[PDB]
């Protein structure tokens, strides 16, 4: 029993964290095989971050300008190239700790673990979700850039995020491992604002199934609804639309608990229009939306890595 | 900026997780140097559930009765001894991945990361607090016994917990790495009940300072309180008494934010009286008590 926000074991990723220093800037890099990936803004100065020409700044750099440090060992940079907002530094040594990995771009609502690093050293691991507005509500201080988000499928690490910046509201923005930003963000010091966020509906429903699996049933009602009636209520409360794909994905949880997806939707619909009434679900007074249907199944089944 | 429940990176601990099988029972072990630590209840049969005599059951065991598996490699057990509720299995191979480590017994309110394992394989990592009633509100299924709680402060892993059992309310009980249980619990299937839990007051206050550091000030007030008056109010909301030690520990956060501890205590009194009023503090509609003053400073 019990339900916790649980991250993937970070060991396979810790063996890849390195420190990348370019001039006065020091951030983290991801060392996979003979390549070190890091945010391209590591080559920026104070004037350069205001309006940057990264092709021009990178052309002025040489391999010895990048100081890469894996533990207490300096790696020699033998090449540098840029892929979108990520800098790739070819090194002379392949990382012996390179796990089986893939680079995957995730969709809003999907969750992943973040290994927060400072100076190439892992300091914390937390779980989070790609918000519908493409930000992550992370926990990052100065020096955390280059920290990565990942999932684990069997023995394979899927890298899905690299930290680039913090927005004025304290939320975070970054890219996939190909340097493509999540959201309408650019890697420059300029006025940027995250759009109004919405609740990840399929995730709230999965967390309601997790609560039922853990013995919390007070919110269940005799009612069911249509996907049409439910999405009208969802739009009204700044909740993401629930598609037939989401209903299908929630199928195994619906079968395991005996509560049809549209029946759980009628519970959510009532919870939105009426509230908790001083009650809690899984020790929370708010509806949790950072557990996907797969996270719930994985935690309430005991899948290992 | 931002505030999250954050666990320590679990890599140093993953390299120590092994599977321990004794007869039909399979749980997890912690392999440090040439010793594998695991709950002593791994030697229990269906008959040894209510009243096991562990000294008697262990004496009937031989080294070849314990099957230890590190990855896909079976380790050879060359000795077995018991220290309180933990079984120690001497193996013929020192773990090459053994980190710098210590065994530390923690106090209620203290937080730690849990590496949840099944069959010697790490499946998840989460942050926990030792509740005032000496239980942990974990997330554990059958087979998770032997999963450990730890802190990784500067290079060294401090092991503070080993999972042993789940109580009837779904809360969890375990021991330090010397086999001494946290709480009035025994490793028997006998009727055991966790005492009524209370909120870790010093931790709520630390989390309120984290909220102020992150720009949340709506809950602050112009009031201060005496420590005794705060405690008389707090105890009525099932909160732990705040001692002078707690007030002293909150000192650096008080200095950093310019809000005196007893002034933050008056804001906490008001929050217990009024509730949130639809508002949230650090994205939470409840007062969070699983961040210690040391966690808040570390994260901020
Ligand atoms: O606590 C136990 N099991 C489990 C532990 N942690 C989560 C569990 C979750 C589910 C589950 F089925 C078993 C779980 C076992 C078996 C029940 O009785 C006792 C009594 C004393 C001792 Cl030391 C251990 C146990």
From Swiss-Prot, chain A:
Stretches assigned to the Peptidase C30 domain: 1-305
Active site positions: 41 (for 3cl-pro activity), 145 (nucleophile)
Compartment(s) where it occurs, according to its Swiss-Prot or TrEMBL record: Host cytoplasm; Host Golgi apparatus; Host nucleus
Regulation: Inhibited by pyridone-containing alpha-ketoamides compounds 13a and 13b. In turn, alpha-ketoamide 13b (tert-butyl (1-((S)-1-(((S)-4-(benzylamino)-3,4-dioxo-1-((S)-2-oxopyrrolidin-3-yl)butan-2-yl)amino)-3-cyclopropyl-1-oxopropan-2-yl)-2-oxo-1,2-dihydropyridin-3-yl)carbamate) inhibits SARS-CoV-2 replication in human lung cells. Inhibited ex vivo by michael acceptor inhibitor N3. Inhibited ex vivo by compound 11a and 11b.
UniProt crosslink position (Glycyl lysine isopeptide (Lys-Gly) (interchain with G-Cter in ubiquitin)): 5, 90
Positions in the Cytoplasmic compartment: 1-305
Superkingdom classification of source: Viruses
Catalysed reactions, as listed in the record: TSAVLQ-|-SGFRK-NH2 and SGVTFQ-|-GKFKK the two peptides corresponding to the two self-cleavage sites of the SARS 3C-like proteinase are the two most reactive peptide substrates. The enzyme exhibits a strong preference for substrates containing Gln at P1 position and Leu at P2 position
Outcome of mutating residue 145 to A: Complete loss of 3C-like proteinase nsp5 cleavage
Residues making up the signal peptide according to the UniProt record: none
Function statement: Cleaves the C-terminus of replicase polyprotein at 11 sites. Recognizes substrates containing the core sequence [ILMVF]-Q-|-[SGACN]. Cleaves and inactivates human TRMT1, preventing tRNA guanine(26)-dimethylation of tRNAs. May cleave human NLRP1 in lung epithelial cells, thereby activating the NLRP1 inflammasome pathway. May cleave human GSDMD, triggering alternative GSDME-mediated epithelial cell death upon activation of the NLRP1 inflammasome, which may enhance the release interleukins 1B, 6, 16 and 18. Also able to bind an ADP-ribose-1''-phosphate (ADRP).
Subunit details: 3CL-PRO exists as monomer and homodimer. Only the homodimer shows catalytic activity. Interacts with host FBXO22; this interaction promotes the proteasomal degradation of nsp5.
Protein name: 3C-like proteinase nsp5
Organism (species): Severe acute respiratory syndrome coronavirus 2
